[PDB]
Amino acid sequence: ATVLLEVPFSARGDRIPDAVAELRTREPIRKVRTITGAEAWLVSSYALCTQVLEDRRFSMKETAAAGAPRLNALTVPPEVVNNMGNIADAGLRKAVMKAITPKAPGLEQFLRDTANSLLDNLITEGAPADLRNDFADPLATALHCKVLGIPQEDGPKLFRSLSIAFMSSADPIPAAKINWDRDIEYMAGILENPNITTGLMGELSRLRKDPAYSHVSDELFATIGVTFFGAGVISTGSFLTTALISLIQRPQLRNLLHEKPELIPAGVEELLRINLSFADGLPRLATADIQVGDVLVRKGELVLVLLEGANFDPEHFPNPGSIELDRPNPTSHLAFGRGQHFCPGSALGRRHAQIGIEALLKKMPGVDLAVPIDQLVWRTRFQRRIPERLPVLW
Ligand code: HEM
Numbered sequence: 001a002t003v004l005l006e007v008p009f010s011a012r013g014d015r016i017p018d019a020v021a022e023l024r025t026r027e028p029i030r031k032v033r034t035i036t037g038a039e040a041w042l043v044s045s046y047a048l049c050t051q052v053l054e055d056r057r058f059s060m061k062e063t064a065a066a067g068a069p070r071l072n073a074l075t076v077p078p079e080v081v082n083n084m085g086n087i088a089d090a091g092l093r094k095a096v097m098k099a100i101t102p103k104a105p106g107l108e109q110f111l112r113d114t115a116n117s118l119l120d121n122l123i124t125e126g127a128p129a130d131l132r133n134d135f136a137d138p139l140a141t142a143l144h145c146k147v148l149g150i151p152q153e154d155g156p157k158l159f160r161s162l163s164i165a166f167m168s169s170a171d172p173i174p175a176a177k178i179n180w181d182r183d184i185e186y187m188a189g190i191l192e193n194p195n196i197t198t199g200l201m202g203e204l205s206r207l208r209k210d211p212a213y214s215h216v217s218d219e220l221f222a223t224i225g226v227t228f229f230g231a232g233v234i235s236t237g238s239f240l241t242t243a244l245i246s247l248i249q250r251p252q253l254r255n256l257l258h259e260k261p262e263l264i265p266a267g268v269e270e271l272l273r274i275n276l277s278f279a280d281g282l283p284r285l286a287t288a289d290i291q292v293g294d295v296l297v298r299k300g301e302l303v304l305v306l307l308e309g310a311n312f313d314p315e316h317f318p319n320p321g322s323i324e325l326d327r328p329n330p331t332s333h334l335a336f337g338r339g340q341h342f343c344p345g346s347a348l349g350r351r352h353a354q355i356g357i358e359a360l361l362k363k364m365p366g367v368d369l370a371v372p373i374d375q376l377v378w379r380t381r382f383q384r385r386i387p388e389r390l391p392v393l394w
């Protein structure tokens, strides 16, 4: 025999497997086995991905229930899976959303400054440079310290939790709990620290002492700090790293963007569309029996929404693998999800990538890989696809 098709198919974030277009054409929803042994439905067309993400009966929260078929082990307490629902129930959604927009005074200039400094330091040191460890990740870390209102010097230690926190493991991870409890203690300290008066933590700290929020738990306040730092940093650092690969490998596009930087937002949007940063489909648990294409998904089954399945669907995005700056539906991709759980940091993520790319093209217009592309080491069993190092010269 064969065996039931296993997911994920590949940890490489520089190319989509030809298999994905085959699945999408032949079986855009089909049964697969996850790393835990569970069965799941893998959905790989734009039409069916959108259907699942816009129907709340495919629940994010219920993926955390004891006994459910699992994509991977939880790395957070089960109540934290419903992190945005908990924020909304506490009456904090508007305030959190306001704090993480890129439009706060000085934020963009801070980003440009940070990027330019990181690049000057690479240039001083001489090629080769590692653009993930010494540019994309420290730019994301600095950004999220600023947005949180926490000291920049605390960013590296918070960051180092992330190579465990965002693992995609078959089994529970003891180091994840150790790092989680310590990071929650750090954020609780921030909330009690009178010097912290700006950003998302300064705003939470004020709301904590307002009568309108007196019955919101200290644990929820700390948890917002830890979760927004971690999701934001991993997601922006990983997206920028793999977007830089896709740009480096298209000298014609690199040169057009360098020359006409007003096209950078359109090119970022295409880079988001083609991005293979999410290593796994987005999980949902069916709360009812729901027809999805030719399959009747049954109550209690796991569904996995394959982002690249949707974003490379030629029925929605003709010539899907090409970066085309003049598409008529450019923001209609699923790179930030869709529906109830649409990314709350989408603007912030776009801006981080736009600024980092602008700054890199101006400082290193001759940027190129310093190693053959096949020599990049792809991180395995993780919730993002990322090269461990990204060696470049210029
Ligand atoms: C390019 C950067 C980013 C990408 C590609 C990205 C992508 C995503 C995707 C696909 C989802 C949907 C998950 C789902 O439906 O299961 C999501 C949710 C989430 N994002 Fe992002 N994200 C980015 C940046 C950020 C930033 C900057 C933050 C915070 C500062 C952030 C915080 C979150 C949180 C807290 C959620 C969960 C929302 C919910 O459960 O309602 N993201 N993101």
Ligand SMILES: Nc1n[nH]cc1-c1ccc(O)cc1
Residues within 6 Å of the ligand: 075, 076, 080, 081, 083, 084, 165, 166, 226, 227, 228, 229, 230, 231
């Ligand atoms: N910050 C985190 N570390 N490990 C898991 C998370 C996390 C969990 C949920 C979430 O909405 C955002 C982030």
